[model samples]
Target chain A: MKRIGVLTSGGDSPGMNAAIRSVVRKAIYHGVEVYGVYHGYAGLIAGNIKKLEVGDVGDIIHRGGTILYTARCPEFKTEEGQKKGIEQLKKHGIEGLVVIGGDGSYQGAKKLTEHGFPCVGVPGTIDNDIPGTDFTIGFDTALNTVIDAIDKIRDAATSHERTYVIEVMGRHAGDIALWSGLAGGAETILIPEADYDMNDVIARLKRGHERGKKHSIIIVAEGVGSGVDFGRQIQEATGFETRVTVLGHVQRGGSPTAFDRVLASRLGARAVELLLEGKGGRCVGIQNNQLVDHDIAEALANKHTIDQRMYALSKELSI
Target chain B: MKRIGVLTSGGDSPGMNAAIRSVVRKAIYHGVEVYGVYHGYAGLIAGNIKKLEVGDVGDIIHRGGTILYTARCPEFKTEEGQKKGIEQLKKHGIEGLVVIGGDGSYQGAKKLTEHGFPCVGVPGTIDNDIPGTDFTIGFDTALNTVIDAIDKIRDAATSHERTYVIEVMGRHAGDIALWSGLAGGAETILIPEADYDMNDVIARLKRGHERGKKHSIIIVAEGVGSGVDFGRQIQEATGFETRVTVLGHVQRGGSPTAFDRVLASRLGARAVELLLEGKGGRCVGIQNNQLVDHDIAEALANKHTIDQRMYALSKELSI
Candidate 1:
């Protein structure tokens, strides 16, 4: 391919810019031109595309969010919308495209490929709900952000001898809750994938109270329930002072952590290489610490699951 | 002084461990033994003191909170209670003392000095309200923490076209809100140190909206008012979606940033040197980028004021 385009779709994530930079730099190194598609698919359909040079991506590897902004484009699901995007790509002489976002973005890539366009998808959400990648681009940064909040909450909790329920991001997947809970020494964790008994949670809080533990932290994923509701239940049952914090979108923002930057760089560069090899309709990922790619349709069909062993370990160690 | 003692009192901060490590190592280097006073004034009154070796402080300079822990003790304000703490210090053969924490902790140090016991106070609160220091040990870390949340909130705010009012911890000081609001590019900032009109704040939001800005952020210090109330008022006045976040105690916990760790180290070492030079009733601080010490009584009498020039610059740049 002599020219390719890149765009960020759906929710923005930390390190998306790094991924964008990597795609631009890697394509340029091979003497191919790079174009930036603004506002994801909507911009593509609107022909809001511009040529990108090396300096365009400079000093942005450490940035959070995407220079190429994202938007929810239900219009992109229509065949007319897809064809209009292709027309714009052809008008700019762009032969291939790199799509960075969550599963919603992969669907766009798959559709484009079916329309005889070459495209590669990159996993770039904090949710970590994508199947092709064992870990998504923004997962590490979000985990650190959650843990940082937990650590801060721990300080006040410890000082006041109180119980805290921290609600973290991760609607369908439990990775964020599980990883941050373990690292933060949370007493109990509630995730959509795992079954948790309220009695067990209350009993554990009482046990820690009797043992004179300075504070107790419970991490609840949004899919499990509301943290405020859980906190009220715990506080009433055990008569322990409880506070709840919904981490919210703060989990999705920050300069990407070192691990995330490197991962995004690697995954992004691999997506470009796959396109250069004429591999269309593929998604890039890292599994077992190695870069890998899979057919987009197959990857999207697969379900993401949390590590059971790690979940059990969180319980074992907290006790 | 052949031996000295260290303790953390009142609320804990991020770099207290670094301060503790520096005191132990600096004293040991001067052939002076160091004793750890568990808890704070409460522990001292209870005679909970132990000898601290070099290994005891290892691998803890980067950690948050204090290795010796901290607590509140109203009894410490009494003459009899002060005598008892001094008795424990003498029993452990500790000739002088290093105290780390907020203004409350400094008061205890001043009382000990008045009783003919040498004590050095180290400013170590996230509030940065201490009089002697331009910036306290944990202030930098907390500023970064608040800005991080703002950045994350900004991501969602931009995507949804909303406004956010973040309540940061500062108590009577506006340093946290002022500094973080500037660094986070908040459209408006409400601080205890500065007067603000609700009408002006609403006008600014309306102006940003008219300018086609994606989002608007307003920072409010805890001392000023509740963020939820401000959020509600703004929403009612402008008909804009607004969200509120109370940062709470999370600002007080985290690994010490490099700047905080270094500042803690220098001030902590300086405290030991003052004791060696027979300078009692003193507090160590960095003023104008230089290490300096002041009489504890005078330092406590001085009021802390924010930089008006910086405050003005924040407005000028934001506009």
Candidate 2:
């Protein structure tokens, strides 16, 4: 119970670094020792950990990606790796561990607790697919990134009377793509949730065009199709000249918006509270728009569902 | 020229969208048609270009990156590609062209002029290496981004008796790295224009540390080896534990700062003035802290050099 070690696992999210900063800032303020485990699970196995001070976490509240860094290590998936990680923590005099990442990272945290090591989890992912959270740390940041791209796309889309099919990031869940598409006033939005048929998409676009839609703007989740292929079919079906904009990795990069930095601050502070209290196998998340704790087991078992109300609004906005 | 096509070439730098929006909005207001050429030279050849309206660029005054998008196309090196681009311009009723990017992009504008097409080059790279411009369109945006990273890295560095070496972007030109590093109060600053010995860097850090210097914040331009490697060298040379934070590509993206947004606005307005005044083959830049134009030919031939006084100040600040 002397030192707490925080590692960001899984994919790098916009606010993950902010969470690291929060943990460092809060721990130093409370007079507790903190360490940063670089490169996530790989760092854990490699013992690439270092003592952290408040200044170690400075000035990164707005940056995207993780400061502690991240990786999905195949070794961390095994029981032996977890035991070795536990041993490494003990060797470093670290009695508490905080893992920040999506569901997969939570599983790692749960394993540490099961093995008698105190561990806590915090949800942080751009996909926003984690259950039991109103919004994960990087979700807002990713949403803004998508919105920025779409708004910029609007510049060329309207001027050419062109149909722009912009493929946004989001595969398993449509959080960023869906939210951005809705807010961007996209005429047609194809998400993984809808599992839209190609023909229906074409018909809807044609109808909108015939209804005097001056220009066509469609937002397609990358999961829907290769945006280029989808855009080609769309153009062929509607007899309108079209362009495909693959936002690509641009959506995954940029500064964490204000919401993410603040939320990360709150959650990282909460994680210190849990660590200091010797709590394990629990997670901190935003529920009812307030920070709360959940049993890690319950969080893992639940299926995350998007806001049906917002999805309905998505329909109206496009209309 | 009644109608002009514009394209952004090279890497996406912040404030590019603002520049694009300005060109679009001002041109539309002036009753001049502005066409967007996507993916730079490649789009020019294929005519993946479109006309823009006022609303097309409205509300994008603060965005990062390019609205029309960009790409590196070496194929434009060929006569056939240039001829095809001219054909595309003729087909789209575009009479002139504006190129927004670095020296490489300026060369493309020069080519267009040689081929009997009026062209104007707008300095947009963060490098600020283009001659005649005191500051390029995105240099201020990037300057803020670098300082931002430094400020964040300082948060963690100050908490410990440690040194933080922050590597900033700028392959050859050190304008951004030097300016941001100095502004943010780095103990050591290294730029491409100067030779930096590890002894000098560590001695400076040690000097600062011995004087009860807070955090040993060091700024290293990417042109100066890896900051991580440099930090390792510093630790080896001076027993002062240090960490390296590479600001990386994040410096290239963000909502443009107010200073950059206004700077881009005025410079863009000036570009339109140059274009409207029948000035051909000229590159627009900030000179003497004022919006100015240079012969595109001479600008292409000359390289932008920083004030030696400012470079000395960079060293002075470090001391």
Candidate 3:
């Protein structure tokens, strides 16, 4: 393709700018004209796009969130909205389109492909809930953020002799909770994929207290429900002072980790190469520690699941 | 002094480990024996002290929490307890003490001085609410931590078009709230030192929303009151979906930032110098970007206050 366009949609993530940087620089290196769509599909429909030179993305690889900014575009879900977006791309003579975001963004790309427009989706979310990719761009950064919070809470909990119920992000996925929980050495972890017994969780808390664990930490994914209510339940059932901390959006911000920067750079450059080869309707991701791509439809059809062994190990280590 | 003892008291902060390392090494370099008093004054009274070699504090400059464990020693507040601690120090020949922690820890140090013990206090709390210092050892690291969380929460907040109420530590001071709010670019910051009008905050949120601001963030210091109640009031007043996140202990835990590590090292060594010069009952601190020393008695009598200029700047930048 002589010209390509890139945009970030839905939730903004730590390494999205890194991906954007890679896309602009890589396309430029291959002598392809690159255009950036602001506000994702919403910007595309409004024709708020600009040419992205190498210097445009300079010094943003380490930044959290997207430089392109992001917005949820319900309008883009309609045929008329896609048509307007296509008209803008055609106006700019842009051919291949590169989209970066979560599942909703992937759907947008799929819809564009159905409309006969070539599009590539790049997975970029902190939740790590996306399918096809072994790890999403911001997952490592977000996991580190969660672990840092966990470590801090551990100190106060130990000093006060209290049980802490920490609610981490991940509405439908358990990766953030599981990874940070295990790393933080939490006594119990609650995730969406796994069924948990409140009685067992309380018993474990009691057992740890008996063993002079000093403090107890329970990492609850948002998908598992409210940490405040969980704290009440635990306090009522076990007669322990339980404190609740909902980690919230803080998990989504901060400089992306080295791992995330490298991953974003690799995936972004790979997506550009795919476009250069006249390939489209694909999504780029890292699988088994290697750069890879799949047909967008097939990747979306596959479901991402948590590692059972890791979950088992988390339980064993906590005990 | 023939030997010196070091302990961390009250809430553990990130740079406590760095401060500990500096004290041990600086004491040893001065040809004075160094002892690590475990669990602050509680351990000191219980004779839970051990000689610390140079290698003992190795590789801990970047670690979070205190390598020398800390505790809220209620007994230390009693004269009998102070006498017992002095006895242990005399028994171990630990002629001088370097106490690293918040103002409560300084009170213990002041008591030690009254009991005829040479003590130097090193400010090392995340709250940054300590007299005789422009910045505490762990304050910078904690500020970064809060800002990181704020950034992450902003992502989901923007996506869902909601407001977030982030509660950070600093029970008696609003330094954490002010600094993080300014750095995170928060829309509103509620700190203890400043009385905020509920109607004004609501108006600000409404105005920002009308101007196309996607989400709003209000940082609340724990000293100000309950973030949950604040969130509820904001939502009720403005018809916005509000979420609350209590940063809690996470703010206190994490590796020290570059600024914190360097500051800890400087202040730690400065305290050792005071002891070497027979300057008893003095605390080391950083003021006006310079290493300074103060009379511990006068410092204890003084109260740390918020910077009105920085607070005003936080308000202006958010707008």
Q: Which ten residues in a row have the lowest lDDT in candidate 3 chain B?
A: B153-162
Clashing pairs in 3: A152-B249, A153-B249, A153-B250, A249-B152, A249-B153, A250-B149, A250-B153, A252-B152, A253-B152
Ranking the candidates on DockQ from highest down gives 3, 1, 2
Per-model TM-score, in order, reads 0.86, 0.58, 0.87
Docking quality band of candidate 2, CAPRI definitions: incorrect
* Candidate 1, position A224, lDDT: 92
Per-prediction DockQ scores? 0.33, 0.05, 0.42
On DockQ, the stronger of 1 and 2 is: 1
**TM-scores for chain B, in order?**
0.98, 0.95, 0.97
Specify the highest-lDDT model's number: 1
DockQ winner, 1 or 3? 3
TM-score (chain A only) for the predictions, listed in order:
0.98, 0.95, 0.98
Task: Give the distance in Å from residue A130's predicted Cα in candidate 1 to where it truly belongs.
Answer: 2.1
* Model 1 residue B249 lDDT score: 71
**Considering every candidate listed, which one attains the maximal DockQ?**
3
TM-score of 2: 0.58
List where candidate 3 sits over 4 angstroms from the true fold: A25-32, A53-62, A90-95, A151-163, A209-216, A235-244, A269-281, A289-298, B1-4, B29-31, B90-96, B118-120, B150-164, B209-217, B239-245, B258-297
Candidate 2's C-alpha lDDT?
0.76
TM-score of chain B of 2: 0.95
